[PDB]
C-alpha cells in the first residue's frame, strides 16, 4: 500500500523523532523525564503502532515532539489502511518482439504470414526472423489450432490473427485482443481475373454496404 | 504546442487515396506505387516523421509525494521543539543569582 | 567509558561529514533512463549533472535543467539549489569544529552540547533534503550509492549527536558532584 | 497529575490522536467531558479514514463521445465548411 | 514540405513522371454544390481537367469515386472529436 | 412563438453538514458537564 | 507487576485487541517480542478492516 520511499522515510523520521525527544527531554541540567535514548525509541515505536504509552512527555518541548509524531502516525496509518482497502476493493503490443518467454505465431498459410515475411518495418521483421526460425514451429494449420494453442499454453503462446477473428473474444470459455491493429486492410469478394461477375458483385457489395446489411450481419 | 486532445473512438473507418481524373492513364501505375510504398513501410515512416518524430507534446501504491506535507510538518515540529527547549535552557542558565 | 567516547564521536563526525560531502559532489543518485548531453539510454543522474552511460557517446554529460502555481516554483527552487543537502554539510562541519574545540578551552562543557545540537540539526536537514529530492524526481528508476551515502550520513550524524548529548550530561553530572 | 490548563490541553490532544492517556478525569464532570470528546474523536477519525478510502477507491476505478455532443448545447461543435466530414454528417442515417 | 510533398516525390519516381505541385485555388477538398451541381476543391480541379492528379489527405468517398478515380488508401482514418483539454498538493492529506 | 418567445426559464470531501450532529452532541455534553459541576 | 505467564497472556491479548497497556516489557528481549507482536497486530487488524 505504501511506496518504498515512504517506508524508508518513515524509518528515518522514527530515528530523528526518537533522538530529538531524547535530546530535549534530558539535556538541561535543570531537568535532572525518564526518556533515555532507549526509552525514547520505545515510546516512538509504540506510538507509531498505535499501542500503549506507559510514559508521556511532561515538558512543553517533549510534548511538541510527541504531538507531531502522533499526528504523523495517525495520517500514515490511516493512509496505509485506506490504500489497502482500495487495493482489495478493486503483453500489450513490440512487446512480443522484445521478449522470448511468450511464443507467438500465425496461420501457417495466410495474408498474416505474408505480411510478416515481407514487412520492412523493423519490429515486424524482427518478429518474422524469430517466427520463421522458432522451434517447435509457431505456425498453425488452422485458426482453431491457433486458438486452442493459446488456450492450452497457460499464457506462453500469443496468436497473431485478423482483428475480426480475434469474434473469439466473445466465445466461451479465456482469450483477449490486446493492443491496436498492426495494419489496416479489407476483405473482398474475389473472382477470376476478367470474370463476367466482377461488375455486378462490386456494385452489390456497395448496395449491401449502403443499405446497412454488412453492419447487421457482423452484429 | 501549446498541447491544449482527441476524445472517444472514431465515428467511422475510411481512407485517403491518390485521385486522378476518371479514365486517367496514370491510374494503374499510381495505384501500384501506393501499394509498393505501403508494403515497403514508407507510409509508416512518413506518418511517424511528420506526426511523432517532431511531436512537441511527446502505479497503485501511495507515493512519497502524496504524504510529503506530513513529513515537512514533522521536521518543522522537531525544529520548533529544539528551539523551545534551548530558549528555556538559556533562560534558566541566565536566571541564576550572580 | 569516557576517553574512547571522544574518539568514537570524533571518528563519527568525520565519517558523517565525508559521506555527506561525497554524496553531494558525486552524481550517482538516480539510475534513470533519459537523454544525455543535448536516443534514450540509462544515466547516472546526480544532484547537479545528469550524466550518461551505455550510450553512443557515454561519459559526456551536462548540468541538469531544473526548470522547464507558486508551490511548484518554490519546490523547484529548493531542489535546484541543494540548500538542504548543503546545509547538512555545513552543520556537520560546524559540529566537528565544536567537538575539536572541546579539547582547547576545556571546562566549558557547554560547546559539546552545541556539537550535539549541530549533529541533530544536520540529520534533520538531511532528511528534508532527501524528501525534496524524491518529491522533485516525481516531476523505471533506481537509487545509487550516492543516495545511500547521504542516508548513512544521516544515521551516523544522529548517533554522534546522541553521544555528544550523553557526554554533556555526564560532564554536568561530574560537575554537580 | 491533575488537570490544569496545560494538562487539559495535552489530554485533549492525545485523546484526538487516539494516543492513550497518562491521566484521565476522575470526577463526574470531568468524565462527562472526557466521554463526549472521545465520542467526537471516534466519529471524526473513522470518517477521515473512511473518506480517504473512498477517495482512493474511486480514483482507482467535459465531452467523451459524439453521443455526449448530441445530447447537449452548451458546447458548440462543427466541421470543415467543405469536406468529407461535413458530407458524412449531411448524409448519416445514424440517429446520433 | 510535408507528408504529401514527400509522398508526391515518391509516387512520381515510381510512376516515372515529372510533376508540378499546385495548391487548390479555392482551398477546398471537393464537394458537389447542391444547386449549381458544380464540383469545387481538388475534386473539381480533376473533374474539369485543371489538374492531372491529387496527392492530398483526400478521403475516398462514394460520391467522389463516381466522378474521379482513387488509388487504394495510403492512409487509414476516421472522423474524431477534438476538444480543448496531476501533481498532488503538499497538504493534500487534509482533503 | 409558443415555446421559446414566452420561455420562463430564460468523491467530494466531507462537509460540515454530515458531521454537524457530533458537534452539537459535543457542545451539549460540555454544557451538561458545567451544570453538574456547578450543582455539586 | 512483572510478566509471569498469566500477565504475559494478558499483555498479548490486550495488544491484539489494540486495547493499550497496563504494563509493557522493560528489557531489550521483552521489547523485541512486544515490538514484533505490535507490528503483527497492526497488519492483521488493518487487513481485517
Ligand atoms: C505546534 C506544533 C508545531 C508544528 C510545526 C509546524 C511547521 C510547519 C512547516 C511547514 C512547511 C511548509 C513548506 C511549504 O510551504 O511547502 C511548499 C513546498 O515547498 C517545499 O518544498 C518546502 C520546503 C521544505 C520545508 C522545511 C520545513 C508548498 O506549500 P504551500 O504552497 O503553502 O501549499 C499550498 C499549495 N499546495 C497545497 C498545492 C502545495
Ligand atoms: C501542548 C501540545 C503541544 C503542541 C502539539 C502539536 C502537535 C499537533 C500538530 C498538528 C499539525 C499542525 C499543522 C497542520 C498543518 C497545517 C497546514 C495547512 O494549514 O495547510 C494550508 C493549506 O495549504 C490550505 O490552506
Ligand atoms: C527498542 C526495541 C525495538 C523493537 C523492535 C521491534 C520491531 C518492529 C518492526 C518490525 C518489522 C520490521 C521488519 C520489516 C521487514 C521488511 C521486509 C523487507 O525487507 O522487504 C522485502 C523486500 O524488500 C521486498 O520484496
Ligand atoms: C461514566 C460517565 C460517562 C459519562 C457519559 C459520557 C458520554 C457518552 C458518550 C457519548 C454520548 C453520545 C450521545 C448520543 C446521542 C444520540 C442522539 C440520537 O440518537 O439522536 C438521533 C435520532 O434518534 C435519529 O432520529
Ligand atoms: C516505526 C519504525 C518501523 C516500522 C516498520 C517499517 C518497516 C520498514 C520496511 C522497510 C523496507 C520496505 C521495502 C518495501 C519495498 C519493496 O517491496 O520493494
Ligand atoms: C486558549 C486556552 C487558554 C490559554 C492559556 C491562557 C493563560 C492563563 C494562565 C495559565 C498559566 C499556566 C498555569 C498552568 O500551567 O496550569
Residue numbers in the entry:
A (entry chain D): 520 to 551, 569 to 626, 633 to 635, 637 to 709, 711 to 717, 719 to 764
B (entry chain A): 716 to 719, 721 to 774, 784 to 823
C (entry chain E): 5 to 42, 55 to 84, 92 to 162, 173 to 210
D (entry chain A): 569 to 629, 632 to 666
E (entry chain A): 422 to 506, 510 to 519
F (entry chain B): 765 to 774, 784 to 813
G (entry chain C): 569 to 617
Sentences from the paper on this structure:
The Phe231 to alanine mutation, which destabilizes this interface, slowed desensitization recovery of GluA2(F231A), both in the absence and presence of TARPs (γ2 and γ3). NTD and LBD changes contributed additively: the R/G-unedited (Arg743) isoform harbouring a mutated B/D NTD interface (Phe231Ala) recovered the slowest. A desensitized GluA2(F231A) structure unedited at the R/G site (Arg743) exhibited more separation of the LBD dimers and an approximately 10% increase of non-swapped receptors relative to the edited Gly743 isoform, approaching GluA1. This suggests that the re-assembly of desensitized A/D LBDs is attenuated by Arg743 through charge repulsion, resulting in a greater proportion of A/B LBD dimers, and thus non-swapped receptors. Closer analysis of the three sets of desensitized structures reveals a gradual transition of the LBD tier into four-fold symmetry, which is greatest for GluA1 and smallest for the edited GluA2 mutant: GluA1 > GluA2(F231A)-Arg743 > GluA2(F231A)-Gly743. Hence, communication between the NTD tier and electrostatics at the R/G site in the LBD orchestrates AMPAR desensitization recovery.
AMPA glutamate receptors (AMPARs), the primary mediators of excitatory neurotransmission in the brain, are either GluA2 subunit-containing and thus Ca2+-impermeable, or GluA2-lacking and Ca2+-permeable. AMPA glutamate receptors (AMPARs) mediate rapid signalling throughout the brain, and orchestrate various forms of synaptic plasticity that underlie learning. These cation channels assemble in various combinations from four core subunits, GluA1–4, with each contributing unique gating kinetics, trafficking and subsynaptic localization. AMPARs exhibit a modular architecture with a two-layer extracellular region connected to the transmembrane ion channel (transmembrane domain, TMD). The ion channel is encircled by diverse auxiliary subunits, modulating receptor gating kinetics, pharmacology and ion flux, with the transmembrane AMPAR regulatory proteins (TARPs γ2, γ3, γ4, γ5, γ7, γ8) being the most abundant.
